[PDB]
Amino acid sequence: MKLIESNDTVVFPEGVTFTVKNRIVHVTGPRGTIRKDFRHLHMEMERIGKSTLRVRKWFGVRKELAAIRTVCSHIKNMIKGVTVGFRYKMRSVYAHFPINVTLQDGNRTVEIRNFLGEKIVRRVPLPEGVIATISTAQKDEIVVEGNDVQFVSQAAARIQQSTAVKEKDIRKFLDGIYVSEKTTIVPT
RNA sequence: AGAUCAAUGGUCUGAAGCUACCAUUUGAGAGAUUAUAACUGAACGCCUCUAAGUUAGAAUCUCGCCUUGUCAAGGCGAAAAU
Predict the structure, then answer these.
(1) Which bases of chain B are contacted by protein, using any atom under 7 A from a CB?
(2) Are A4 and A57 in contact (CB under 8 A)?
(3) CA angle A16, A24, A76 (to 5 degrees)
(4) Straight-line distance from CA A83 to C1' B81, in Å?
(5) Nearest to residue A94, comparing CAs of A180, A159, A173, A179?
(6) Which of A14, A64, A102, A178 would suit a FRET pair with A49, their CA atoms being 20 to 30 Å apart?
(7) What burial class does residue A75 get, using C-beta atoms within 10 Å of its C-beta: 0-12 exposed, 13-18 middle, 19+ buried?
């Protein structure tokens, strides 16, 4: 069944603008600007008023209609990124071996050492627009921060999956660095 | 003394050439991705690696390096003398 019309709207708080057209959005706020392309979906996106963006679909099937809220949530994430940003805190857990985490290449690469005592050095590059920092106060804590949630979470996932155990049971060899918290930069 | 014959008379040494893991030398990179693990995220106001979109990804696959390249829209250039 092809529903005649189905739409959703996103409302923008004060201080941020979107200026959408041709299915590419250009959200801008205090923390810069994020541009996202949504041309893989054949919906109609337009400005209705001053701070409302409407995403609409004519004659869509279940699978196409499922994407309206997806796009709206993506735009909401852009708003959050430009207002308060994104910050992922990850904790290192080990039984015996301290996981030594450092930054090199102009603070653009994360190096993991001593993970389970292996002499190999694990190198993870950081996506553009994302930064990293070790906590000097809270030990064993690494923070990856940025505007774009997609890239921030991709960097966090890269770091988390970089540390994996092999040939030993993960039910009790729990060593590794895990994403413990997902929050915003500005205290909410 | 010099040699010849015995279908290579026989024994010892034997260069040269050929030749032995029986001697010596040389053998390696990317790209898209599978299984899989994940990101964001609906459907299904919650969840979810999946539906749209994203990551990492291999003795596999494609290419690179390497061999041929008298190739019928007679495969295609440069340049010399005619």
Answers:
(1) 37-44, 51-56
(2) no
(3) 45
(4) 78
(5) A173
(6) A64
(7) buried
